[PDB]
Design a protein around this ligand. Structure first.
Ligand SMILES: *Cc1c(COP(=O)(O)O)cnc(C)c1O
Ligand SMILES: *Cc1c(COP(=O)(O)O)cnc(C)c1O
Ligand SMILES: [Mg+2]
Ligand SMILES: [Mg+2]
Ligand SMILES: [Mg+2]
Lengths: 389, 379
């Protein structure tokens, strides 16, 4: 059995991978994918996962297989990659730059049903003029600011919403919907505050759609979501789809917001112990910030996990030990409480492998060309992901 | 031709005239000290950047991973120091590089790692070259500078084990917390002294120690004398960054890496311009937050590279940066100053962190044309 025997001899596990490596526990990932799709199905709304967390074709394929409708992307590079992989229904959810209009036009002309978003009269004018010149009715949604976080028209700003919506509609473009992202949910840590923010996000985005429609303008989609508000919303009246992406893996920021446990976290960075400073209680590992990223989202939350929570090779949290510091290719493993562990070298011998849970999975993942997707039998497979623009 | 007007954004642009001045400045300082410069390529991981460093007089390179050793060896560079405590599990990869003809040097700071190297080398018929890392300032790895028994035990393990004990090295990375010439000079002296002290203790015990290697970019530029030292290692100086400007070893105008970004909208009530360089372009590094002037997620410059003091990225989401006044006020009519589609260039907090976010740099020539210079990602 030639292929079998060769593949067996080539197969990696967590003991044979070189470190650092970004490992996806596939069973935890599938539980996360099921949980989010079940919740949206219960709310009677579509799920349009945001692939910026993974930028990985097989990850998005698992989201689609579970029932997802389309994807959200954060770059046109993502739109190109996932359209080539067979995803047609793609929302580019970053305010459209006019100079990217030729690439968006080429993606639509090759058969990608690519939606763009704007929040200004001038961006709507640019799209409509290019669309008229090029004989393309782009679909464009208007981004709404519901929580003061980032881009978007105020939900209560009827004159600007009308001006933008008329610019698109009069200009022969398809005004397809409104969207909002309540990213301020990341500053909360109670179920009450998260439920209230999810209600403000839904209410505001539906308010903007109702004002466009009261002026005779079409607005068939109402799209909301962050992972914390997707999991917290009690009701989604008026909403057609919810966008969420970090949930596929979760991370320690999400654990601190309270929408998951550390044991739901599916992404970890496999690392090796490469030295010590025994008098300071330090183990030095080969996962520095270039593996973890410089994200320190947990520093301002209820529990600071430094550059990440230490787990053993079986993925079980080792409470009390975190990466307290990080240089580029070296992480400093020590007690979070600030005590010097006695005998750090017997606790973590040279060559020991550990798995570090990330502050932010979106930021850790981008540091790696690929993930190693870990199956229940202990084998891994390389799953590429996209870097750059 | 491709230029700053035609590139998609965000893009990581190296101003070649600025890079070359940085290259010349460091090389000239190391010449004046009578030491070799072994640049640390972990800042750029880019073959043409290191080629310009070599053209100006650099001797060999330092790398932070064996993937960089593979890349630079495949491009013809053979004098490579891998300056991260060696993991025994990567010994097969190091061995294959040496057998292929790469003169790859490894480092250790423990008896156990030295025993692992020496046993594998004897079995494989390879006299690995290994330097001992010395801790001269409490920053990271290494044998304590006055820890002679540890030093000698590692040295004897290597040399009596049939390996080539090639040298000692230190990196005084605590230089990054300083911001005065006096304090940088004293740290550079402490770095030099402790590294030299270790070499002398090896030699006094009859062990070879031909290389004494020190450096960080701040201590390379601040050191008043380098007696006893054979080479200096420095990397971030090739581009500089705002961390370095705040340490005081360069000006913002010297920073040769910037991120070209387009204005994609505004929040006029807040005086924000939104740009398409978020933290995925800048990285999450916020090293200037702990220094005397905080530059947020980066210092704004105009398309010509003019620094615009007082505008910085005060915040950043993944693919959106928030450009606003550093003084906290709301710029009145921000959209009339920076209309949609305006291009700006952002100086990074940490050149090593921002560079790693991009698959390639755009190297900007005097005539305004660019050439793409790929760089390495991953392990
Ligand atoms: C990232 C993002 C999402 C998903 O939010 P998470 O909390 O990261 O899952 C949704 N919509 C927009 C516009 C996004 O940028
Ligand atoms: C990065 C590094 C250097 C170069 O110091 P910079 O201040 O970044 O130029 C030298 N030696 C070692 C061991 C390093 O890790
Ligand atoms: Mg995120
Ligand atoms: Mg491109
Ligand atoms: Mg650095």
């Amino acid at each position: 059995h030639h292929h079998h025997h060769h593949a067996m001899s080539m197969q990696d596990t967590l003991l044979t991978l070189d470190t650092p490596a970004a490992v996806i526990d596939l069973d935890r990932m599938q539980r996360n994918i099921a949980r989010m799709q079940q919740r949206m199905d219960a709310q009677g709304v579509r799920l349009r996962p945001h692939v910026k967390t993974s930028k990985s074709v097989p990850v998005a394929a698992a989201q689609r297989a579970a029932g997802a409708s389309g994807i959200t992307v954060s770059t046109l590079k993502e739109a190109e990659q996932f359209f080539a992989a067979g995803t047609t229904d793609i929302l580019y959810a970053v305010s459209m730059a006019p100079h990217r209009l030729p690439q968006a036009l080429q993606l639509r002309r090759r058969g990608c049903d690519l939606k763009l978003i704007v929040d200004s009269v001038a961006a709507a004018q640019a799209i409509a003029a290019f669309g008229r010149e090029q004989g393309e009715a782009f679909e464009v949604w208007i981004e709404i600011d519901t929580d003061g976080h980032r881009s978007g028209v105020g939900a209560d700003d009827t004159p600007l919403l009308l001006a933008i919506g008329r610019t698109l509609h009069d200009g022969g473009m398809r005004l397809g919907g409104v969207l909002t992202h309540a990213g301020s949910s990341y500053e909360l840590d109670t179920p009450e505050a998260l439920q209230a923010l999810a209600e403000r996000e839904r209410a505001g985005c539906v308010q903007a759609a109702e004002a466009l429609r009261a002026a005779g303008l079409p607005c068939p989609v109402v799209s909301v979501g962050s992972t914390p508000t997707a999991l917290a919303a009690s009701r989604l009246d008026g909403v057609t789809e919810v966008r969420a992406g970090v949930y596929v893996f979760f991370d320690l920021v999400m654990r601190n917001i309270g929408v998951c446990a550390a044991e739901d976290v599916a992404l970890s960075v496999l690392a090796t112990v490469i030295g010590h400073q025994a008098d300071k209680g330090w183990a030095i590992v080969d996962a520095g910030w270039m593996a973890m990223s410089r994200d320190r989202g947990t520093a301002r939350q209820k529990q600071d996990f430094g550059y990440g929570q230490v787990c053993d090779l079986q993925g079980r949290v080792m409470p009390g030990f975190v990466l307290t510091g990080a240089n580029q290719e070296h992480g400093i493993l020590a007690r979070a409480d600030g005590a010097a562990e006695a005998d750090i070298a017997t606790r973590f011998p040279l060559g020991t492998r550990l798995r570090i849970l990330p502050n932010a999975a979106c930021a850790t993942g981008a540091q790696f060309p690929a993930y190693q997707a870990l199956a229940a039998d202990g084998s891994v497979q390389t799953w590429e992901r996209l870097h750059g623009w």
